[PDB]
């Protein structure tokens, strides 16, 4: 029920009744600890409870990373061996600075395709010169990837130190989903070349995808039969193994190493059949064994990469955060965004120093790590060690691995991103603005490539956020019978408007973008054309003044001038959605007050929160003409005051 | 007073008590009339009342436009004669499609400097070749200016037809003020070359202003004494005349033609002293007499100009609208933004066809037109006719006009834009966000030039709008004694929080940018670390389940598990500032509900407006778990329900 009986309360009354009023060691060890979680979570590691699970999880993660690293290195354009380096250099670094215990840092399809586009831009493939140009191009691509990794790591470390871990919140879920779907489309188009076996020119810039698809279609009859057969067999095997594992996941504690088995079988078949020599099927080539000494980044490329560097960084960070947060909700721990950004930046920087390319976290790999029984980053560290073994001696065993098979892996690794079209269609029933953002991001990333596409998508998202506040549901409120609740009359038929009092509510805040829109909507839906009546009144007053001046040389009420008096004697604004009052909002409010006082209508402001009143006071909004007694706290209070003060 | 007694009302009750519920001839003539205001305002023109005033106003406007056109043509890099063409071609066109009576369309400093930058970019000044290269460069600059005018006119007409007259509202007042101040600085730096007489290379791209200033300082000792003396004398005369006119404006019905008198005196003195031959003072040159036949735009430049075309268009439109609206408030008529955009676009297009450069409206010229007694666009048309006379025969009289004098005019014509630094300093007391936008726009336009500077300023303004919603005044509300008004406790000391009930209000809307921020702020200021308590509860429940499973193999309340029970039994959200509910907002609300129901706290939503409920219903927010009875209409109603339903 309700029994609230009180005297009428304005802003001044409300203030009267509410009494308005306005290092060294310890930190040296807190900052060090928060920068290095390892010192806090490794000493308290339960060996008996988690060792075996972490060992099995790391074994599975390494098993899955061995073919994924090579495939994504091939996607990036680099020789496959460097991919393994990723699976070994950032990961261990993430073991030291990482806060998420259930994500595996490594090669991601989107990051790999972004690095591949960069390498193609700064090192196009040329068919004129074959062997020595190929070696020089591989070296140049490796240097470009290392410099890009160094720059991305520096950007991420800098953003993390300034605690700019909230930059991900600008990337809404529809935008990220569209970007990932377009990245999957890009990856499929790029891998079509390796699946068919065609030789194609390196396209770059806008509309690269369309040109690549057209060239693939044009050169399709030249596709090698053996390469297509091998790619189809590899894809069929991968699909069958993945479906089998999904359909009896409960029986087997760990997923079947389908990708590793496919890679081993392809290598064995190619060795036993001489595919490269006989059927001219492309192979990965020679994989060096050992650790490459660190190489300093080439600063001369900093101008070329920076525009495509920061973007990549952000994208990776975004994905990383998402995974961590998801696993956070699955294990009841907090993942610090800033520390995650710092860890990823340090991993990328150390990789770039040690001949690597930018890395991120993989969803399928993280899910496998969780399922196998992982509970800490130690598992991931174990994975790195296994990759180290592959780097040390088991690297030349994959000399005769068919190349297309790797491409096939990536094609079978884009299931979720292409599944997101289901989400795309589902957005047609929940929010069409999200669907518009999704389609704009998808089209921009397809046409203007990923680097510009993300910028265009972010700018369009911000513009649509601004536009959404420029299209609010203006409501001429009315009183629900025998209540104090005021709701839209056009929506609630039973609601009846108060006689002589109008209440106008805007669902969105009134700032510089929609201040004029708010004023025009108020004047349009107020029932009286305020501008026309004010102009008439001014003209009539000027004519009367001229007549008086002429009479003197020879020798204000609306009813007096014959103008139609508005039905409502008072107007009440419901600025409950108002957040901040800037200069334009204050100007609009003053203009509304002056215009309605000229038409002999007193304006009352109702439901203003704490910051609005303070900002109005600071902006010199209040004066003798506009006192604080008009700034009522509740709409019904203002309606009661207006009914108690009707002008004669 | 208050006497509102009613049963408790939820969303379902409120719906029950409010009954929630969801060409040819004439047109064609209406469209023709609204596109051509002339057919409506010329036939009803009062000859006796307004003819003489319009004639005098047009005479004054032409008097002021004669030197201003030449000065701004010199600023744009074109030969001065083409400037006069502007004062004759767009203006008359604006007489046909114009809706504002009290603004004069012509050459503006910002538009002129933007055209000059474009011409310098597409036709750099070369000192190696002197005469024939000068003629070819002048022809190329004229073609570039004509093509730019055509493209700007097409852009403006297209925007007006789609009724995109609200694109100006993105340009806030601080942004426009900073852009104009930086344009004035640009103009002063550019005119320093003509004032001193130095020969300088054509700088372009970012940091052009700094390089130009450094080169001027480096070559300062080579400045000609005669040119500096003439410029100083012209500036002193202009300042004296302007101050005299301002200080006795009431006595003289029309302003003293200071600029025209200065131009005539400079021409006479140069003729009578042989400044060009003896003192080597620069002169304007030869002014052709007659009308240039129309020249089709060169489409091959469309790629180069488009990036700098649209920008210019918008800027001009912005200024135009402002002036019109101001004069609207001074004469009680409505100026249609779309029709103004169409008129300006048609004027620019016809000028570009007829060898002209983009035009806008001038504030000082419009003020002089208003003061002299103008009441219609006919006055402006009269101005064009006078300029026509100057184009016909009185064009070769200005052969020996000193060039620096024209530059001096522009320097004395930047008084308001440089005065805006007073506004800049005044922004330090009203709104520091506006000051930040002003400084960012000023610096960006100074360094990265006007074309990129405007884009950077707009992007930063949108980003700061988004950020402003990410920093809201989260408030833990409390009840003002013996009232129903709930206000911030940290701000109002007397306000007391309800025992067992918490109210949380965010001043800004909850959307994808600040949804996580809103949830984290709620959990932080709710007095209980929700995440830690939920994680403990989950761990304790899992341990108990494991113990039960072990017991079975061998053979929910917070108080039961020993966890600390929160002081508040219910939580009430005050989403009065919520405008639209997208997918991320719905996910955040569902997560808040689930998390607080796990901690045994029931969440109630209060003060939701019309669109919020509809969007929640459309998004499948409501289900069996979350009924519509929790969506209370008033905060006090929800508090009463929570107090009437405390769990045992
Ligand atoms: Cl993946
Ligand atoms: Cl001006």
Author numbering:
A (entry chain B), B (entry chain A): 28 to 49, 62 to 594, 655 to 747
Paper passage:
Members of the SLC26 family constitute a conserved class of anion transport proteins, which encompasses uncoupled transporters with channel-like properties, coupled exchangers and motor proteins. Here we have determined the structure of the closely related human transporter SLC26A6 and characterized it as a coupled exchanger of chloride with bicarbonate and presumably also oxalate. SLC26A6 is widely expressed in different tissues including the heart, kidney, pancreas, and intestine. We also attempted to follow electrogenic Cl-/oxalate exchange by patch clamp electrophysiology in the whole cell configuration but did not measure pronounced currents that would be above background, likely due to the slow kinetics of the process. Together, our functional experiments characterize SLC26A6 as a strictly coupled transporter that exchanges Cl- with HCO3- and presumably also oxalate at a 1:1 stoichiometric ratio.
To reveal the molecular basis of the described transport properties of SLC26A6, we have determined its structure by cryo-electron microscopy (cryo-EM). A dataset of the protein purified in the detergent glycol-diosgenin (GDN) at 3.3 Å was of high quality and allowed for the unambiguous interpretation of the cryo-EM density by an atomic model. The structure defines an inward-facing conformation of the protein that generally resembles known structures of SLC26A9. In the homodimeric protein, subunit interactions are predominantly formed by the domain-swapped cytoplasmic parts including an extended N-terminal region and the C-terminal STAS domain, whereas the few contacts between the transmembrane transport units are confined to the end of the terminal membrane-spanning helix α14. The substrate binding site located in the center of the core domain is accessible from the cytoplasm via a spacious aqueous cavity, whereas the extracellular exit is sealed by extended contacts between core and gate domains. The presumable location of a bound chloride ion is resolved in the structure of SLC26A6 at a low contour of the map. The anion binding site is placed between the opposed short helices α3 and α10, which partly span the membrane and whose N-termini are aligned to face each other in the center of the core domain. In SLC26A9, Cl- binds in a deep pocket with low field strength, whereas the same pocket is shallower in SLC26A6, where a conserved arginine (Arg 404) increases the positive electrostatic potential and thus likely stabilizes the bound anion. In addition to its structural role, Arg 404 likely also contributes to the stabilization of bound anions by coulombic interactions, with its guanidium group potentially engaging in direct interactions with bicarbonate or oxalate. In the density, the N-terminal part of the IVS folds into an α-helix encompassing amino acids 569–593 (CαIVS) whereas the following 61 residues are unstructured and thus not resolved in the density.
